């Protein structure tokens, strides 16, 4: 299903394990560039062709690096021969109160099972 | 600092534990109880910046399932009033044709008071 | 309700005229910090107590400066005592293909008449 | 290269004129009035051209009590395109304001897919 390796549009890779309990655990790779991922997903989705909702978070700190920022992906898994996870993300960095207005970026990413 | 009980600027409540190397665990509020999990910057800057964090809640518990998930992205702020300022994304499972309307966006502030 | 001067929580200011077929025109703000705004709003909202949908755009260029960016605000007008415009915004900066992933900030602002 | 007729991946069409002073005027497709701004003097460094516009979903046939704003940048190239992120807000009561806004992304090209 979701368990496995996913490739994003521009290079990044993640390995995720989708637990029976609805937990998402894995690693995201931008080892200097490997980071822990953690999330949740709908473990009892609809079969009417709806995708499966999920989200996950990466804090960009590891034993070598720290960008003082975090990304959260919200989106959905669509199975099939053309399996994909379509997401929108929010990147939030630590800032002072005075730069909190410019603290968050928004984007989107598509992950597929090959590439 | 992050560990403890927080209240939403409307009325929800969440209980968090922050693990020494960046894990966020706890629950977002009986039938209204859901698991949350996330990560945080466990070695933030010392310049007065806040602490970047995120978490996810999938809206399924042993009683209900909305077929959707929400992620909060933000930062913890130490001050007179410690706060967590977030922006959030709620994605619902949809067929492909309705994907364009699958995701809500909003923001929220949590405080330990109230 | 919308025509007039609005102040955002952060110090900035905008003067708008809401025309009769949904046009929004005005300036966002000394001269060096004034910029043209243009937008649209629902000139016939429901009367169920719902807010009035609107939006507008500002590119950050004037005769004196050019940040090579633009902001869009999407939100609603809520009249009455504390009349307010509640918005979410996107700021996009022109980037090369390579930095496009970090081209768009998101946030929120609330405008009041005082 | 902004002036012209553009196509979005889901079939939507927008006709727009880019004027002298950074104004954007046109129609989104029945049809809805659009207006926006663009950077009339972009960087030389191969950066894209920042831009944005708005549509309120009311015309003479219907009104959805909503508005969408697209924020993005134009990239010339052998196949020009406009990459955008968008927010769609509906009028709602206070109690429902929390779900009043949708967020998405849209790519327009001068060729119809």
């Amino acid at each position: 299903g979701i368990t496995g390796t996913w490739y994003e549009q521009l290079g990044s890779t993640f390995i995720v394990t989708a637990g029976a309990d609805g937990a998402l655990t894995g690693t995201y790779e931008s080892a200097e560039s490997r980071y822990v991922l953690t999330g949740r997903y709908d473990s009892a989705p609809a079969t009417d062709g709806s995708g499966t909702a999920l989200g996950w978070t990466v804090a960009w700190k590891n034993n070598y690096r720290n960008a003082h920022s975090a990304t959260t992906w919200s989106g959905q898994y669509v199975g099939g021969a053309e399996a994909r996870i379509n997401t929108q993300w929010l990147l939030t960095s630590g800032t002072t109160e005075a730069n909190a207005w410019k603290s968050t970026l928004v984007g989107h990413d598509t992950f597929t099972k090959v590439k």
Side-chain angles (χ1 to χ4, degrees), chain A:
Chain A
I2 295 168
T3 293
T5 304
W6 293 88
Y7 302 96
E8 122 280 36
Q9 296 158 339
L10 269 301
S12 291
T13 291
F14 77 88
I15 326 315
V16 72
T17 294
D21 56 339
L24 244 33
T25 85
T27 302
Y28 197 98
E29 327 191 354
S30 117
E32 230 196 338
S33 305
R34 301 198 254 263
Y35 300 85
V36 159
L37 80 76
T38 201
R40 310 289 300 167
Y41 76 108
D42 180 1
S43 63
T47 68
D48 51 11
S50 282
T52 287
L54 73 210
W56 68 86
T57 297
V58 172
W60 302 104
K61 165 164 167 21
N62 69 20
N63 300 116
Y64 317 93
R65 316 199 301 186
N66 188 357
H68 297 311
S69 51
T71 283
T72 66
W73 285 259
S74 199
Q76 53 180 138
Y77 160 82
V78 180
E82 337 255 22
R84 2 271 279 194
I85 292 174
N86 301 299
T87 63
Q88 315 204 244
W89 49 261
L90 300 165
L91 184 9
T92 305
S93 297
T95 64
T96 54
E97 305 305 294
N99 314 307
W101 76 268
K102 47 153 104 65
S103 68
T104 303
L105 287 145
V106 60
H108 43 103
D109 229 315
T110 304
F111 297 88
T112 56
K113 284 204 151 195
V114 173
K115 248 46 241 256

